Structures are given as structure tokens and as C-alpha cells.
From a paper:
In the fourth category, both the gateway and secondary pocket are blocked and the inaccessible binding cavity harbors an aromatic residue or a proline in position of Arg24. The second-site loop assumes a twisted conformation in these phosphatases. This architecture is present in the subgroups NT5 (PTPH1, MEG1), NT6 (PTPD1, PTPD2), R1 (CD45), R2B (RPTPμ, RPTPκ, RPTPρ), and R4 (RPTPα, RPTPɛ). PTPs with particularly high enzymatic activity against generic substrates were RPTPσ and PTP subgroups R5, R3, NT1, NT2, NT3, NT4, and NT5. The subgroups NT1, NT2, NT3, and NT5 exhibited a pronounced preference for acidic residues N-terminal to the phosphorylation site.
Protein tyrosine phosphatases (PTPs) play a critical role in regulating cellular functions by selectively dephosphorylating their substrates. The ∼280 residue PTP catalytic domain consists of an α/β structure, and biochemical and structural studies have led to a detailed understanding of the catalytic mechanism (Barford et al., 1994; Zhang, 2002). Key features of the domain include the PTP signature motif, the mobile Trp-Pro-Asp “WPD” loop that in the closed conformation positions the conserved and catalytically important aspartate residue, and the phosphotyrosine recognition loop. Here we report the crystal structures of 22 PTP domains, including two tandem-domain RPTP structures and a detailed structural comparison of this protein family.
Author numbering: 646 to 904
The structure:
Amino acid sequence: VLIQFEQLYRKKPGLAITFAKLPQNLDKNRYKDVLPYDTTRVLLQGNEDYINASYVNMEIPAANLVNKYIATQGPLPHTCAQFWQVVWDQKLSLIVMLTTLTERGRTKCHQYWPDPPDVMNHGGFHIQCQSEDCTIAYVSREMLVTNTQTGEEHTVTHLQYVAWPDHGVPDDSSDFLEFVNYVRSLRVDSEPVLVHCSAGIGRTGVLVTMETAMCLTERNLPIYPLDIVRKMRDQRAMMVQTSSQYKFVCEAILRVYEE
């Protein structure tokens, strides 16, 4: 289990990564080594089409189910406009953020939403935070996004998980599992859920894996985490980054089963 994960490829052989490496796009990547594949990267309309974001879709035909995601990095100060453009273009209603802005004195994410009652403007979108409600492990916010060119409004639910430790992984998986079940509760139809952490591969991969395992468990279907991970990595490289993360995922999967 914890040995074949380490043997598994990080990037799918043959899959080109070219746009992410273009000189004009380099400072739009948070981490120089975490890049979207050309084939699954999200495209922006405009003269510069690039964001470090990937479409990641998890098919479970044995449940007549497809769970769509957009996996992305924490936006940078100069990529917030693009982040909100993706949210707008895809009319996404749920953003899941798996980090605090800083962890052990290191920046992980730019604050791309306002603290109420402030507002922000990014790429011609006005953002207002209508509500902010905390639980022990996470914060739920309702965002009103206004396209300043058209006056059109869109409501977006923003979930931020704040309890992940600055080192390693949660000692007790309960709160994270509750969070994933809340995310599942808000998922719509075949509408992607935007998920990000700092690079959009580690905690993001853990989340996608656990939602997938929960869907499988619910319909009494077999769960092979190494398959689930490979499937994600064919769509965004390096997802589920560390053995500690993979080990965490596995034990959690056995908990939900046994509980």
C-alpha cells in the first residue's frame, strides 16, 4: 500500500506541459514545479488564456456518477483576476479552500475575498462577503460576485478548512471527514467544485480521494485508493503529494467503512 504509492508515477508519461512553462506565464505559477497539463488545463477567454488550474473529473460508472472538480493553486496577488474569471465563466457555486493564508510563517495563498463589510474588485468583478459563519475546523462564507460590465450577480459558497496542522496531517480525521461530507452535501448536478490548497495537489488530492471513497462506500462499491490517485494524476500531476497524505487518506477510508 504505502510502497506502491511511492512507486507510482508523479506525472503521466507522454502528457505535455508547455503553456505553463511559457515565459509570460511563469510568475502565474505559485510553485515552479507544480504545473497543469496542456490537455486538462482550464482556459480563460482573453488574449492571455493561462491559469494554473486543471479540470479533474472522477467517473464512477458503477454508480452512474461523475464528480467534476477544478483543482488549482492558491491565487497569487496578480492572478486573483483570473481565479474569479474562472469562477464566473464556469458559474461555479462552491469554492473549497484547504489552507490558511499563511502556515508556519510561509505564504500559501493571497486573500482573494473581502473581510465583511469590505469589498474587493478583481478583473472587473466586485466581490462582497454576505455572511461568515465558523465551526471548529472550518469557515463558511457566502460571496456575492458582480460582473461590473453587465451588472449580473452570482452567489458563491466559500468553504475554508482552517484546522489542518502546519506539519504533517490531522491526528484525528473526524473533523476533516465531516467537512468532506458537508462539501458532498453542497455539490450540484454536474457542476464542478473548485478546490485549492497552496499548490492544488496535496490537500486537494486528499479531498478528491476522500469524496470519491465516500461515494463508493455509499453504494457498497470497491475502493482502490491507488487507482483513485492514478486517475487524478492523469489529470493533474503529483496529486496527493506525500506518503503521510496517502497514509492519512487510507486510514480515513477504513474509518468511514468501519464507522
